[PDB]
Amino acid sequence: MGIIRTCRLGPDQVKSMRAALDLFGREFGGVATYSQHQPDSDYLGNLLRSKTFIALAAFDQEAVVGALAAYVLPKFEQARSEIYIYDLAVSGEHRRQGIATALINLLKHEANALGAYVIYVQADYGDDPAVALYTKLGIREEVMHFDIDPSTAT
Amino acid sequence: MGIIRTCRLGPDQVKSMRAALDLFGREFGGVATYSQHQPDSDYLGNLLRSKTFIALAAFDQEAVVGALAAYVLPKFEQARSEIYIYDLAVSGEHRRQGIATALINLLKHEANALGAYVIYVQADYGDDPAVALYTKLGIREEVMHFDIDPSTAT
Ligand SMILES: CC(C)(COP(=O)(O)OP(=O)(O)OC[C@H]1O[C@@H](n2cnc3c(N)ncnc32)[C@H](O)[C@@H]1OP(=O)(O)O)[C@@H](O)C(=O)NCCC(=O)NCCS
Ligand SMILES: CC(C)(COP(=O)(O)OP(=O)(O)OC[C@H]1O[C@@H](n2cnc3c(N)ncnc32)[C@H](O)[C@@H]1OP(=O)(O)O)[C@@H](O)C(=O)NCCC(=O)NCCS
Ligand SMILES: CN[C@@H]1[C@@H](O)[C@@H](O[C@@H]2[C@@H](O)[C@H](O[C@H]3OC(CN)=CC[C@H]3N)[C@@H](N)C[C@H]2N)OC[C@]1(C)O
Ligand SMILES: CN[C@@H]1[C@@H](O)[C@@H](O[C@@H]2[C@@H](O)[C@H](O[C@H]3OC(CN)=CC[C@H]3N)[C@@H](N)C[C@H]2N)OC[C@]1(C)O
Asked: Which ligand is nearest to the CA of B34?
């Protein structure tokens, strides 16, 4: 065991996508957010069918032990793409084994296939594993982010 | 004059989109990035046709004096959407007149129409106007961001 295989999920792999989401739940400690109100199978299908969403999964045999959810941003200034890693998680029982790194690597192959010139991801202050991983793999910038409630539309 | 009208651009408005991009160029001081290698009309059409890209523009009569480029992120954990402001600019000759605010407001109407529960935007340290605008309009978080070269795929 410990034969890890990485792939980009298609619309035929809703079962594996749901397992990625539970992984996300367990590992982000948001079991409710990620497992208890999942979309219907059509919704996931439509995600997985799309050219601008990428779901990557790592399998130790049958179980999903790593996943990565990204979005492709076709840019408007020029005919070029950027990729935005939204979420990335490896099973606690499978860390420091290169799975995250391999999913990013896989992601780079998808990017190359798409002609996307860059991939980016955001990390939180204190998320030290994530910060190390992306610092090893990327160029860091510190920035601000703001949420806005659309409720207040006038 | 100074009658400003805000709208979400459709695929019939490639001419106005190109003007948004020049605005972006002039105002971000990236005239090359934004004006000199624009996509072909089809590419823009396809952007403007899409349900997951939003281009908002403000017009003082015929000229574009404000624009906003966002992406809709249909989420995977749950059947819900988030909106990501990528770029936002108001003509230097038209600032502090509520145009940015009105484009965001417009954006909130689009979000509501989409069922999207939040909108977010990133700002740079020292971009004081932007920081004030989003601080007035949003809840700030400080975070890191990392670019990764897909070139190194192995
Ligand atoms: C971060 C996470 C994905 C790491 O996955 P991983 O497979 O263990 O990472 P890899 O083993 O492929 O590579 C780890 C590399 O990143 C860094 N790193 C990973 N875990 C680390 C840790 N615990 N402490 C310090 N650095 C760490 C190191 O550079 C390491 O390279 P090295 O072992 O040669 O020094 C996982 O532990 C996790 O908690 N996921 C959720 C975190 C997250 O970012 N969520 C929000 C979405 S981005
Ligand atoms: C930031 C920018 C969009 C402002 O547009 P604007 O129409 O002038 O903003 P509005 O007039 O609608 O509202 C401005 C509000 O934000 C803040 N603000 C705007 N300009 C400001 C400035 N120069 N200094 C301080 N605060 C400022 C204030 O809260 C103000 O509210 P108030 O006048 O009641 O105090 C524009 O000046 C610009 O430079 N665009 C590019 C910046 C950018 O963010 N680019 C990267 C993509 S996010
Ligand atoms: C509340 N505001 C939000 C803002 O936090 C941001 O969320 C980022 C998101 O991509 C990823 O979140 C995951 O990671 C972690 C640990 N870091 C916990 C929860 C996970 N989902 C991650 N790459 C970094 C996040 N900052 O954008 C969306 C938002 C709504 O604005
Ligand atoms: C180089 N790394 C990049 C990283 O900077 C980030 O760019 C953000 C982008 O949305 C918007 O940029 C605009 O604003 C400004 C002034 N702030 C200058 C150039 C404009 N295009 C803005 N909201 C904040 C940016 N930080 O993401 C993409 C990226 C490739 O990773």
From this structure: 4
Class of CATH domain A4-141: alpha beta
Q: Experimental method used, please?
A: X-ray
Shortest-distance Cα residue to atom 12 of ligand 3: A87
Question: What is the CA(B99)–ligand 4 centre distance, in A?
Answer: 21
Contact (CB, 8 A) for A115 and A80: yes
Identify the sign of the CA torsion B129, B134, B140, B145. negative
Q: CB-hemisphere CA count at 13 Å for B139?
A: 6
DSSP state of B100: H
For B4-143, CATH gives: 3.40.630.30
Those residues whose C-beta lies under 8 Å from the C-beta of residue A60, and which sit 6 or more positions away, are A1, A2, A3, A4, A91, A94
Using CB atoms, pick whichever of B37, B71, B149 lies closest to residue A78.
B37
Show the tokens assigned to A38: 């999942």
Question: Using the 8-state DSSP alphabet, how is residue A109 labeled?
Answer: H
Resolution (A): 2.1
Residues with CB under 6 A from ligand 1: A 27, 87-90, 95-101, 121, 123, 127-130, 132-133, 136
Phi then psi for residue B59, to 5 deg, are -120, 125
